[PDB]
């Protein structure tokens, strides 16, 4: 790759990581407020908590099904009792937690239903303590397709940036780049964002954030997510519940 391209990349990447996260302009990164956390599509986003292991993000795609990363599901080591899902959870700056839709225990974990090479997993939830499924309280995220995405497109990534602030849902504007090498994009994310939903202007889920991978050369990074194409969509239809 060329130097002119590298310089350009550094300047763009610097817009998100050149300043402290608390100082990022609102249009690029911001907290989802109380009112919005109870509106679609924000309410389909929840915290995937793996006891004593990690705290990431997940998206409700079925009545009892949560979509997240395979690398996140792996932390549970096949034991569903170590995992819980908390939709629209919020721990304010005073340390007070609120779970408007309650907290859900996990019934089963499908670590790699799309194949070990695809960083996606399905988590099956149990109903609440009253026998009501999460999918009956709120509508699951409408699944779209990444096939219509073009380089330069700006989308909304929604999740729980744990490393920045614990249990506080945030939205990050992302900008797609070099789609010939997968769903790559500029934008601010932290490890906790693993499993974050990527939505288009119509509120359709088109991808799931995964992690940061090398870009251009070994000494540069970019965000990487899994796009939702025909294959991913079909498996979801076969396994959804």
What does this entry show, briefly?
The chain is mostly beta strands and 241 residues long.
Question: How many structural domains are formed by the residues?
Answer: 2
Arrangement of strands in the largest sheet = 10-11-12-15-14-13
Kindly state the percentage of residues in helix.
10-25%
CATH homologous superfamily of the largest domain - what is it?
Trypsin-like serine proteases
CATH class of the largest domain: Mainly Beta
What overall geometry do the principal axes of the alpha carbons give?
Answer: globular
Q: Note the main sheet.
A: 6 strands, antiparallel, barrel
CATH topology of the largest domain, by name, is Thrombin, subunit H
Total helical elements: 3
Number of strands: 15
- CA radius of gyration is 17 Å
Beta content comes to 25-35%
PDB class: complex (toxin/peptide)
Keywords: hydrolase, serine protease, COMPLEX (TOXIN-PEPTIDE) complex
Assembly: monomeric
Entry title: exfoliative toxin A
């Amino acid at each position: 790759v060329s130097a002119e391209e590298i310089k350009k990349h550094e300047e763009k990447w610097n817009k998100y990581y050149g300043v402290n996260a608390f100082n990022l302009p609102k249009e690029l990164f911001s907290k989802v407020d109380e009112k919005d956390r109870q509106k679609y599509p924000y309410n389909t986003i929840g915290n995937v908590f793996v006891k004593g292991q990690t705290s990431a993000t997940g998206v409700l795609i079925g009545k009892n099904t949560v979509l997240t990363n395979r690398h996140i599901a792996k932390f549970a080591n096949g034991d569903p009792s170590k995992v819980s899902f908390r939709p629209s959870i919020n721990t304010d700056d005073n340390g007070n937690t609120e779970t408007p839709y309650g907290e859900y225990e996990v019934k089963e974990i499908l670590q790699e239903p799309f194949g070990a090479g695809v960083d996606l997993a399905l988590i099956r939830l149990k109903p609440d303590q009253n026998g009501v499924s999460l999918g009956d309280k709120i509508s699951p995220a409408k699944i779209g397709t990444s096939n219509d995405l073009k380089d330069g497109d700006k989308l909304e990534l929604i999740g729980y940036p744990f490393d920045h602030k614990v249990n506080q849902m945030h939205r990050s504007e992302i900008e797609l780049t070099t789609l010939s090498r997968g769903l790559r994009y500029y934008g601010f994310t932290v490890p906790g964002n693993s499993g974050s939903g990527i939505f288009n202007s119509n509120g359709e889920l088109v991808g799931i954030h995964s992690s940061k991978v090398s870009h251009l050369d070994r000494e540069h990074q970019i965000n990487y997510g899994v796009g939702i194409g025909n294959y991913v969509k079909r498996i979801i239809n076969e396994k959804n519940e």
